[PDB]
Enzyme design. Structure first.
Site, PDB file in Angstrom:
ATOM      1  N   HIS B  41     -13.131  -6.079   7.082  1.00  0.00           N
ATOM      2  CA  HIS B  41     -13.120  -6.975   5.695  1.00  0.00           C
ATOM      3  C   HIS B  41     -11.755  -7.756   5.667  1.00  0.00           C
ATOM      4  O   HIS B  41     -11.317  -8.288   4.765  1.00  0.00           O
ATOM      5  CB  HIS B  41     -13.125  -6.032   4.389  1.00  0.00           C
ATOM      6  N   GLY B 143      -2.526  -3.353   0.396  1.00  0.00           N
ATOM      7  CA  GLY B 143      -1.897  -3.477   1.533  1.00  0.00           C
ATOM      8  C   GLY B 143      -2.367  -2.392   2.268  1.00  0.00           C
ATOM      9  O   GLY B 143      -1.788  -2.198   3.714  1.00  0.00           O
ATOM     10  N   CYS B 145      -5.032  -0.600   3.680  1.00  0.00           N
ATOM     11  CA  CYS B 145      -6.047  -0.633   4.674  1.00  0.00           C
ATOM     12  C   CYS B 145      -5.553  -0.740   6.194  1.00  0.00           C
ATOM     13  O   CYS B 145      -4.414  -1.291   6.468  1.00  0.00           O
ATOM     14  CB  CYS B 145      -7.198  -1.759   4.323  1.00  0.00           C
TER      15      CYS B 145
HETATM   16  C1  LIG Z   1      -7.229  -2.360   1.375  1.00  0.00           C
HETATM   17  O1  LIG Z   1      -6.049  -2.816   1.513  1.00  0.00           O
HETATM   18  C2  LIG Z   1      -7.728  -1.879   0.176  1.00  0.00           C
HETATM   19  C3  LIG Z   1      -7.069  -0.551   0.024  1.00  0.00           C
HETATM   20  C4  LIG Z   1      -7.324  -0.027  -1.600  1.00  0.00           C
HETATM   21  C5  LIG Z   1      -6.827  -0.732  -2.392  1.00  0.00           C
HETATM   22  C6  LIG Z   1      -6.189   0.271  -3.544  1.00  0.00           C
HETATM   23  N1  LIG Z   1      -6.138   1.494  -2.991  1.00  0.00           N
HETATM   24  C7  LIG Z   1      -7.023   1.495  -2.016  1.00  0.00           C
HETATM   25  O2  LIG Z   1      -7.379   2.293  -1.318  1.00  0.00           O
HETATM   26  N2  LIG Z   1      -9.118  -1.965   0.242  1.00  0.00           N
HETATM   27  C8  LIG Z   1      -9.960  -2.625  -0.548  1.00  0.00           C
HETATM   28  O3  LIG Z   1      -9.283  -3.393  -1.648  1.00  0.00           O
HETATM   29  C9  LIG Z   1     -11.499  -2.511  -0.707  1.00  0.00           C
HETATM   30  C10 LIG Z   1     -11.956  -3.610   0.226  1.00  0.00           C
HETATM   31  C11 LIG Z   1     -13.234  -3.726   0.162  1.00  0.00           C
HETATM   32  C12 LIG Z   1     -13.956  -5.042   0.955  1.00  0.00           C
HETATM   33  C13 LIG Z   1     -13.933  -2.513   0.884  1.00  0.00           C
HETATM   34  N3  LIG Z   1     -11.741  -2.924  -2.051  1.00  0.00           N
HETATM   35  C14 LIG Z   1     -11.489  -1.695  -2.958  1.00  0.00           C
HETATM   36  O4  LIG Z   1     -11.183  -0.424  -2.702  1.00  0.00           O
HETATM   37  O5  LIG Z   1     -11.921  -1.598  -4.278  1.00  0.00           O
HETATM   38  C15 LIG Z   1     -11.219  -0.679  -5.266  1.00  0.00           C
HETATM   39  C16 LIG Z   1      -9.986  -1.026  -5.793  1.00  0.00           C
HETATM   40  C17 LIG Z   1      -9.314  -0.286  -6.756  1.00  0.00           C
HETATM   41  C18 LIG Z   1      -8.031  -0.618  -7.435  1.00  0.00           C
HETATM   42  C19 LIG Z   1      -7.510  -1.807  -7.044  1.00  0.00           C
HETATM   43  C20 LIG Z   1      -8.080  -2.730  -6.137  1.00  0.00           C
HETATM   44  C21 LIG Z   1      -9.148  -2.272  -5.281  1.00  0.00           C
END
Ligand SMILES: *[C@H](O)[C@H](C[C@@H]1CCNC1=O)NC(=O)[C@H](CC(C)C)NC(=O)OCc1ccccc1
Ligand SMILES: *[C@H](O)[C@H](C[C@@H]1CCNC1=O)NC(=O)[C@H](CC(C)C)NC(=O)OCc1ccccc1
Ligand SMILES: [Ca+2]
Ligand SMILES: [Ca+2]
Ligand SMILES: [Ca+2]
Ligand SMILES: [Ca+2]
Ligand SMILES: [Ca+2]
Ligand SMILES: [Ca+2]
Lengths: 304, 304
Positions: B41, B143, B145
């Site tokens: 992603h 940040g 991931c």
């Molecule tokens: C990768 O950087 C990110 C890690 C999330 C961000 C906040 N805590 C984590 O573990 N992954 C994502 O943003 C993910 C991307 C999709 C294409 C899988 N989406 C996600 O995790 O949505 C949940 C979320 C909750 C709270 C804040 C931001 C996103």
């Protein structure tokens, strides 16, 4: 919405760890530039350890009495001296891994990471705090002396603890990197006891602000307290007195959450008097006191 | 007499971490030999993330669409492919830090260390377990991931997890190093929920054996139970069923402590039915389930 007790990445310290042997006694040392730091009781025997006289024990040693091993490599000692409870060993080689670093003496309540080592070989990393009684609730076995505690800020490793002994209660005692004990302990295996401990009030408060920042408000209330009235309940529950300096420390967190410090003290008072009655804060059923205000800030950046 | 949740030293993994940028989206990757692994992603936008079609999104990218940074150094991508939920990026340079390593798919209940990273820069290390519902109770911000989980055995780093997402409950989901999700999750930001969790019975038992080995016997009793009668109380208290394989796993610890496994199940049954009523085991007021039998063994060597 989650919160771990997190240690600093340990690579910069791993590259500094070495094995030091004198007789049948082996422990870890810290190799920085052309010097190796280690606990001075490496020169004791099993017999010497009751009541060592290190003056006279060290005069009987030469450079070649110490065997220093960095992995396969063997380091030659060219010099040696005592600095309080540490030995300083000079070696022919300057550690090419030496990180930028500082020697710091930490204060009670402050946290740091420990890299537990055996035979010069790192085995684990964990976070801990200097208790008010100058011990740490560590996890150390024989072979672990010379293991170090540290914080990392930017690129700079701040070493603050080297491990020396375990007390009868299972907690641990040691020195700064100048060989001065934290606490009223000495490096002899006599009858020593940790004094009474206390809960680190500033850190519990910081942790409650963490809980609010990660979205949990259930323990808050409409009451406030004065510093003196809070400290009355603090002594009852064996909490460190809260001082005006501690209130100033909590300013940024208070600013970020909109909860005045003495309002959060009101909340804490309510928690100490009524228990948690089945509920958790940041996943814990108990009031946690080994996160500093400064730890809370790094952990959770914005997200408010 | 003490017991921490301890992480593996992180230096071997720190040397592998890099930054990967595609558009305005940045995350961490893992640089091993001449390949960089990262979540797929990274090629999505804010808009794409609801329902990305990665086939078609990746065909629209070239080698130069990815910017890979190892500290100051900039790595040139010469190749790229998708493997399930990961991108594999080929670079001109072979990471001179590459440790010996394995790719392993871990099983529910097993533990590992996580090196949390932001912008390719390690920030912390902590221990965690694969829950039975295939999530981990992590501490991850934006940040994060591409952050990885790993165990270290001897010299060999066994990578088992790369971080992808946070679920609405605050727990975390990700893949193995082949890009196959743990659990029934997908890397799209749709309505996904963790299924019901359960306590890891084998690990609680291991932890109770730890408590006995570190000298605490207060929770033991003169009763025994059958496997089926224990599992009756296990469902009541949302504990995983105990199997004969789990009993065999606990053999060495049972041998070391002289407490038969079903006697320890009797003890646990008594603890689940009568609570701990104010008492701690290894410093905890609750039954801990993120230490495996294998963790207990390393932690405390002999000392029985
Ligand atoms: C990768 O950087 C990110 C890690 C999330 C961000 C906040 N805590 C984590 O573990 N992954 C994502 O943003 C993910 C991307 C999709 C294409 C899988 N989406 C996600 O995790 O949505 C949940 C979320 C909750 C709270 C804040 C931001 C996103
Ligand atoms: C250094 O290797 C060792 C670390 C102890 C050993 C077990 N857990 C620890 O933290 N330090 C000592 O053995 C120390 C040496 C004196 C000269 C300071 N003596 C000591 O800690 O006695 C307590 C003890 C308790 C249980 C087993 C062995 C020693
Ligand atoms: Ca002295
Ligand atoms: Ca002192
Ligand atoms: Ca007052
Ligand atoms: Ca797939
Ligand atoms: Ca699965
Ligand atoms: Ca049965």
């Amino acid at each position: 919405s989650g919160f771990r007790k997190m240690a600093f990445p340990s690579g910069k310290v791993e590259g500094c760890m070495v094995q030091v042997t004198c007789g049948t006694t082996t422990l870890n040392g810290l190799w920085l530039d052309d010097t190796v730091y280690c606990p001075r009781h490496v020169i004791c025997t099993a017999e010497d350890m009751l009541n060592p006289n290190y003056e006279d024990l060290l005069i009987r040693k030469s450079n070649h009495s110490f065997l220093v091993q960095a992995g396969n490599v063997q380091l030659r000692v060219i010099g040696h001296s005592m600095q309080n409870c540490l030995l300083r060993l000079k070696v022919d080689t300057s550690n090419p891994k030496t990180p930028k670093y500082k020697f710091v003496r930490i204060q009670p309540g402050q946290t740091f990471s420990v890299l537990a080592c055996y035979n010069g070989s790192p085995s684990g990393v964990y976070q801990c705090a200097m208790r008010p009684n100058h011990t740490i609730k560590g996890s150390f076995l024989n072979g672990s002396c010379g293991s170090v505690g540290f914080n990392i800020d930017y690129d700079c490793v701040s070493f603050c603890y080297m491990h020396h002994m375990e007390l009868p209660t299972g907690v641990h005692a040691g020195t700064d990197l100048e060989g001065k004990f934290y606490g009223p302990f000495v490096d002899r295996q006599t009858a020593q006891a940790a004094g009474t401990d206390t809960t680190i009030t500033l850190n519990v408060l910081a942790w409650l602000y963490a809980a609010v920042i990660n979205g949990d408000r259930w323990f808050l209330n409409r009451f406030t307290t004065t510093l003196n009235d809070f400290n009355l309940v603090a002594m009852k529950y064996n909490y460190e007195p809260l001082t005006q300096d501690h209130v100033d420390i909590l300013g940024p967190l208070s600013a970020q959450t909109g909860i005045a410090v003495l309002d959060m003290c009101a909340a804490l008072k309510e928690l100490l008097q009524n228990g948690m009655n089945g509920r958790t804060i940041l996943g814990s059923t108990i009031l946690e006191d080994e996160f500093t205000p400064f730890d809370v800030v790094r952990q959770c950046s914005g997200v408010t």
